[PDB]
Structure formats: C-alpha cells, structure tokens
Amino acid sequence: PLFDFSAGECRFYKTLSDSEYYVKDHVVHEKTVLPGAAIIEAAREAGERLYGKSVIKLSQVVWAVPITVEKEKTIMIDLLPNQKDGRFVVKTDMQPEAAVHCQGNIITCGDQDASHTERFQLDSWLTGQKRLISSAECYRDFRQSGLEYGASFQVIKQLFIHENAVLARISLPESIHKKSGTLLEPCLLDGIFQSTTGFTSGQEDDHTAYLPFELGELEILHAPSANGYAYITAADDDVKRFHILFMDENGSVSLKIKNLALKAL
Amino acid sequence: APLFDFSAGECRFYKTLSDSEYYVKDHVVHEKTVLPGAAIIEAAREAGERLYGKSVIKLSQVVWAVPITVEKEKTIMIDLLPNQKDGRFVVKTDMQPEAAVHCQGNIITCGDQDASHTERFQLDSWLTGQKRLISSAECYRDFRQSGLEYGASFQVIKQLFIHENAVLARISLPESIHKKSGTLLEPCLLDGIFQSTTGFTSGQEDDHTAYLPFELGELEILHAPSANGYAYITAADEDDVKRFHILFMDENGSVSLKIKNLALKALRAA
Numbered sequence: 189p190l191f192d193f194s195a196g197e198c199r200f201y202k203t204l205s206d207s208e209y210y211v212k213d214h215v216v217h218e219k220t221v222l223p224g225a226a227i228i229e230a231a232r233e234a235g236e237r238l239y240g241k242s243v244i245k246l247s248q249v250v251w252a253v254p255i256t257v258e259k260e261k262t263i264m265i266d267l268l269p270n271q272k273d274g275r276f277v278v279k280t281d282m283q284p285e286a287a288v289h290c291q292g293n294i295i296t297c298g299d300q301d302a303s304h305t306e307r308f309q310l311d312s313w314l315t316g317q318k319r320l321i322s323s324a325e326c327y328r329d330f331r332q333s334g335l336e337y338g339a340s341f342q343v344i345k346q347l348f349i350h351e352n353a354v355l356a357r358i359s360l361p362e363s364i365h366k367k368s369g370t371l372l373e374p375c376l377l378d379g380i381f382q383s384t385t386g387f388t389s390g391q392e393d394d395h396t397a398y399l400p401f402e403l404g405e406l407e408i409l410h411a412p413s414a415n416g417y418a419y420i421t422a423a424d425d426d427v428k429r430f431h432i433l434f435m436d437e438n439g440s441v442s443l444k445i446k447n448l449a450l451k452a453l
Numbered sequence: 454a455p456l457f458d459f460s461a462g463e464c465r466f467y468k469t470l471s472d473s474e475y476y477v478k479d480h481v482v483h484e485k486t487v488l489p490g491a492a493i494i495e496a497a498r499e500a501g502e503r504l505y506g507k508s509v510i511k512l513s514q515v516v517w518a519v520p521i522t523v524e525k526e527k528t529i530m531i532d533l534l535p536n537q538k539d540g541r542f543v544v545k546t547d548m549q550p551e552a553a554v555h556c557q558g559n560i561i562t563c564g565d566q567d568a569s570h571t572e573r574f575q576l577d578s579w580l581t582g583q584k585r586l587i588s589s590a591e592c593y594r595d596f597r598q599s600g601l602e603y604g605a606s607f608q609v610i611k612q613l614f615i616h617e618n619a620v621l622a623r624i625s626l627p628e629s630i631h632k633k634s635g636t637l638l639e640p641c642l643l644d645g646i647f648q649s650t651t652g653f654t655s656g657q658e659d660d661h662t663a664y665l666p667f668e669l670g671e672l673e674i675l676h677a678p679s680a681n682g683y684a685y686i687t688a689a690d691e692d693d694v695k696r697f698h699i700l701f702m703d704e705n706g707s708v709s710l711k712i713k714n715l716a717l718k719a720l721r722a723a
Contacts, residue, residue, distance in 0.1 A: 190636040191468050191496045193503070193531070198464035202457050230457045237459070237506060265459070370456045 200234045200265045204257045209364060210374040211257045213338025216397070216453070221254035222263075223341075224400035225377035227290045231276045232372060234265050235294040239274065242297045242408075249292035249403035253453070255280060263289075272296060292403070306409060306441035308433055310417060313348060313355040321347035321386065329389055330382070333397040334453075340364050343379035347386045354386030356418040358434075371411055380443070383418045384430045384450060397453045398428060404447025412442040426452040455506075466500045466531045470523050475630060476640040477523045479604025482663065483722045487520035488529075489607075490666035491643035493556045497542045498638060498674075500531050501560040505540065508563045515558030515669035519720065521546060529555070538562065558669070572675060572708040574700055576683055579614060579621040587613040587652070595655055596648070599663040600722055605629060609645035613652045620652030620686040624701075637677055646701055646710070649684045650717060654695050662719045664695060670714025678709040693719045 206212050206220045214223045228246060235243045255263065266277045270293065278290040323345050327337055340361055348355040358379050360366065366373055381400055388398045413436040423429035423446075432445035472478050472486045480489045494512055501509040521529065532543040536559065544556040592610050593603055605627060614621040624645045626632070632639040647666055654664045682703045689696035699712035 189499060190633055190640075191499050193466035193468050193496075193500060196465035196467065198504070199462035200459035201462060202459050233455050233457050234459060237455075237461075238464070238504075240503060264462075367454050367456055369454055374456075 195238050195267075195269060197266065197268050198238055200237075200267065201262060202230065202265075203260050203262045204255075205260050206257050209338075209340045213340040213375075214378070215336035215338070216254060216399070217334045218336075219256050220258065221256050223374055223378045224251045224254060224290065225372070225381060226374040227251070227255075227278055228377060228403075228406065229370065229372040229374055230263075230265060231278070231290075231292065231294060233369070234267055234276065235274055235296065238267050239294075239296050241299075243294055244297045244301075244408050245293075245295035245405060246403070247293045247295065247405045249290065249406070250288075251400045251402070252287055252289045254399065255289050267294070272298070304409065306433075306444070308419060308435045308439040308441055310355075310435070310437070310439045313350065313353065313419065317348040317350050317355075319349040321349060321389075326382075326385065329395075330385065330397075333395045335397050337382075341375045341378055341382075343375055344382055347383065349386050352421065354383060354418075354420040356380075356383035356386065356420065358383070358416055358418055360414040366414065371408065373412075373414075376412060376414070380418050380432055380434055380445065381448065381450070383432070384420055384428065384448065386420060387422060387430065388428050388450065398450035399453050400448070401427065401451035402447070402449035403445065404449075405445070407444040407446075408442070409444065410442050413437075413440075416442070423447050461504050461533075461535065463532070463534050464504050466503075466533070467528060468496070468531075469526050469528045470521075471526045472523050475604075475606045479606040479641075480644070481602040481604070482520055482665070482720070483600040484602075485522050486524065487522050489640050489644045490517045490520060490556065491638070491647055492640035493517070493544055494643060494669075494672065495636065495638040495640055496529075496531060497544070497556075497558065497560060499635075500533055500542065501540055501562065504533050505560075505562050509560055509674070510563045511559075511561035511671060511673050512669070513559045513561065513671045515556065515672070516554075517556050517666045517668070518553055520665065521555050533560070572711075574685060574702050574706040574708055576621075576685075576702060576704070576706040579616065579619065579683075579685065583614040583616050583621075585615040587615065592648075592651065595651065595661075596663075599661045601663050603648075607641050607644055607648075609641055610648055613649065615652050618687065620649060620684075622646075622649030622652065622684040622686065624649065624682055624684055626680040632680075637674065639680075642678060642680070646684050646699055646712070647715065647717070649699070650686055650695065650697050650715070652686060653688060653697065654717060664717035665720045666715070667694060667718035668714070668716035669712065671712070673711040673713075674709070675711065676709050679703040682709070689714055 701710035
C-alpha cells in the first residue's frame with residue numbers, strides 16, 4: 189500500500205436473520221438469540237477489516253443478555269481506535285441511552301510480531317476421571333435448563349470430570365460449512381463456553397442456565413482445529429469463572445481463555 | 454468469505470505526508486512542493502478498497518481545490534461517507550468546519566457478479582501524420598516556463614503527437630522506484646496522463662499558464678494500467694478552464710483507463 193492509513197472511528201452494520209444457523213439453532217428460553225460467542229467473531233472480523241492485520245486477542249469483554257433475533261435484526265459494531273489497538277461496542281439501537289449488548293478491546297498483531305507456541309500434555313486427562321458425561325447427558329441437562337442447542341451447536345462429544353479440572357472433547361458437525369475466512373466458528377467457540385457445564389451443572393435438582401457475562405482475555409495462537417479438546421479450570425454464587433485452553437488432539441494449543449465469567453439466567 | 458459481511462458506515466483515514474516521498478519531492482508548483490491531485494485519487498481508491506472490501510472501479514464528480522502544500526510533514530484526513538453501496542470521500546488537512554476541502558468525490562465499487570467487458574482503441578493511425586511532434590525535453594521545458602518543475606519521477610511523457618483535434622502521448626514510468634504491487638494508480642502515471650493535456654493547453658508561444666486539476670467527471674478503471682502506454686486526449690469543449698476526455702491504453706490499444714470531463718484550471722503564481 190502506497191498510503192498506509194491509520195483508521196479512526198467506524199461503525200459496521202449487519203442485519204442478522206434467524207435463517208442463519210448460528211441464530212436458528214441457538215434457542216434460549218424458547219427464543220432464538222445470537223450467541224455471545226458470535227459477537228466475538230464479528231468483532232474480530234470488523235477489526236481485521238478496518239485495521240488490515242490479524243486480531244490475536246480480545247480482552248475485557250462484557251456481555252449483556254443475548255440479542256434476541258426473530259426474523260431480521262440489525263446490529264451495529266462501533267470500532268474506536270485505541271493506539272494501534274481498538275475497542276468495540278455492540279448495539280441494536282442508535283440513541284446514546286440505548287443498551288450496550290457487548291463491548292471489549294481488540295488487539296492486533298504487528299508487522300514484526302514473534303511466533304509463540306504452546307503445548308498441552310493431554311494423555312493423563314483422558315483416563316483416571318471421576319465421571320464421564322456423554323453428549324446425550326450434556327445436552328439433556330442443557331435443555332432442562334432452558335438452553336435448547338440445535339445439532340449445529342452440539343459439539344461437545346464427551347466430558348471428562350476430574351477432581352479439579354474438566355476435559356471436553358469437541359467436534360464440529362459436518363453439517364455446517366466452515367468458511368476459509370471464519371477463524372472462530374460460533375458453534376466451536378460457544379461449545380468451548382458450553383464445556384464449563386462440567387463444573388456448573390452441579391446437582392441433578394439444579395437446572396440453572398449459565399451464559400457468558402465477562403471474558404478477561406481470549407488469545408488466538410493460531411486457527412483452531414475443527415476437532416480438539418477444551419481443558420477447563422475454575423478461576424475462583426450466581427457468577428462462575430473459569431480458565432480454558434483449546435487444543436487439537438495432539439495438545440497443540442490454539443486458543444487461551446482467561447477469566448471467562450458466566451452468570452445465571 | 455466472511456461470516457459477517459458488514460456494511461461499513463462513515464470512517465476517517467489519516468496519513469502524514471512528507472516531502473521525503475518522491476510523489477511530493479518531485480512535484481514543485483510555483484517553487485513549492487505540493488501533493489499532486491492525482492495522488493489524492495489513488496489515496497481515495499486505496500481507502501475505499503480497504504473500508505468496503507471491494508475493488509474500486511470508478512471515481513466520479515471529483516473536485517479539487519488548489520494543491521496541498523507539503524513542507525516537511527503534513528497530515529491529511531480522508532473521510533469516507535456511505536452512499537448506499539457506493540461512497541463519498543472528502544479530503545482535509547484542517548479539522549474545523551471553516552477549513553478548506555482539498556478534494557472530494559464519489560467512489561463506486563464493483564459487484565461480485567459483474568460482467569467482463571474489454572475496450573480497444575485503434576492506436577496505430579495516431580502514431581503518424583501528426584502536425585507536430587513534441588519531445589520529452591521540450592515538453593518539460595515548457596512546463597518549467599509555467600512554474601511546473603517536474604522532477605525525474607514525474608517526467609513520464611516521452612512524446613506528444615499533436616493532431617488537428619487530438620493529442621496522443623506516449624507515457625513510460627521511470628525505472629527509479631517500482632510501484633508497489635498494491636498501488637493500482639501510481640501517482641506519477643496518473644499525473645502524466647493529466648500532464649499530457651498540455652498538448653492542448655500550451656496554447657500560444659507567449660502564453661505560459663500553469664493548468665492544474667480542478668474537476669473530473671469520471672475516472673473508470675477497466676484494469677490495472679500498464680507502466681508503458683499511450684494517452685489519447687480529445688477536447689470536451691462546451692479561457693481559464695480547459696476540459697478533456699482521455700483514454701489510457703497499452704501498445705495494442707487495450708484500454709485500461711477512461712477519463713470523462715477532466716477539467717484543469719489556470720493557477721496564478723502566489
């Protein structure tokens with residue numbers, strides 16, 4: 189580029205539809221709602237478009253209650269420059285008094301940024317578990333809580349419940365067509381969030397639905413695999429906090445989630 | 454493709470220009486280094502492709518004020534405002550409303566399913582029979598007489614063929630520097646296309662008026678222009694403002710750029 193501009197503020201617009209799989213198959217208390225994870229990928233795409241470089245981190249994310257999407261609904265993502273980085277604000281109504289559905293910081297990688305890799309020792313966590321939760325149990329419990337995940341979002345195949353950790357096997361369904369540009373598939377990322385249910389499910393009498401409320405940091409080391417494992421620990425009421433690593437079957441870590449907070453709905 | 458294919462709203466882009474850059478350093482107008490008007494066109498094109506994520510195929514209804522002077526470093530602001538699928542651009546260096554608009558115009562993007570069409574020009578007949586042939590050295594001496602001192606980067610006119618109702622200019626970019634692959638409209642190429650109107654605007658031998666870009670009805674980009682080619686200039690017609698149509702093409706007449714109603718305006722020395 190002969191003129192390598194610095195971008196100022198910019199608003200991006202997208203009309204969501206319940207025709208899209210990430211809406212129609214995400215039913216919360218009998219309503220189709222945009223998953224909070226989808227807002228993360230939308231912010232990442234807007235940032236990559238405006239700044240012309242990879243977004244490697246999203247931090248200090250805060251969610252309101254999910255955006256309900258019945259037929260069409262237009263969302264606005266406002267990107268505000270913060271030095272080389274940016275911050276985003278997501279709304280559906282324009283007036284200043286209107287609710288912010290999601291907000292957070294965008295961090296881009298620089299031209300000379302270094303390559304850093306992380307590896308997880310998976311083997312010991314595939315055996316010795318206290319309890320094993322099958323996909324069928326996991327999503328029956330979710331539905332009894334009011335979280336009716338369609339097949340596209342049924343990505344958890346097994347939960348290994350250990351004493352102080354949960355290992356979740358995750359696999360994207362063949363049905364969804366994953367675009368080359370889509371780094372964070374909403375169903376993948378929501379399934380990573382879902383896997384905290386290995387902790388929050390609790391008693392058989394408890395049918396509480398927990399949804400994303402805050403996220404300290406999401407770090408992208410590289411494009412996530414369609415199949416892999418999430419390793420979840422409690423970060424340490426109505427709010428539950430966790431750290432999560434997402435990795436491929438050989439322990440190559442693709443995503444790091446620090447301080448994911450979910451709140452009872 | 455992107456899972457979220459956004460429509461972009463308004464956005465401002467910022468660039469600090471320096472007279473260290475060749476497209477400024479070698480563009481001296483009445484003893485001042487000024488940003489060429491042609492350079493703003495490529496800047497608007499680049500901003501548009503960045504913001505809209507689609508090829509810019511046309512810039513239309515462009516209006517220029519007097520050139521932006523650049524002594525050491527100066528920051529320009531390009532404001533892109535949405536116009537349905539298309540866009541509008543406004544170029545400023547000063548922020549307040551009272552400040553001058555240096556350049557403005559419309560940006561038109563291409564669609565995903567737009568058709569493929571090519572245009573060719575019968576070039577050969579215009580390389581002979583001319584009333585007058587003007588050499589590169591003569592061309593830039595005449596420019597200097599008017600206060601337009603083009604440095605080596607902008608000395609892209611190699612020959613002007615002066616015909617009765619048309620001018621054919623042979624244009625060739627200098628070896629010095631290679632346009633980045635991403636730069637579609639190299640400022641020195643596009644300014645040379647603007648320069649070639651001097652085959653008309655020179656006028657009388659005693660007249661040494663400098664004409665600079667003032668308006669541009671339409672610039673259509675059919676495909677990436679060649680570094681070497683020919684400009685075919687005709688008078689739009691219809692004293693201080695001269696209007697032209699221009700085609701830019703390669704040696705086989707393959708048209709890469711179409712210019713409708715380029716208006717140049719006399720600029721008096723300070």
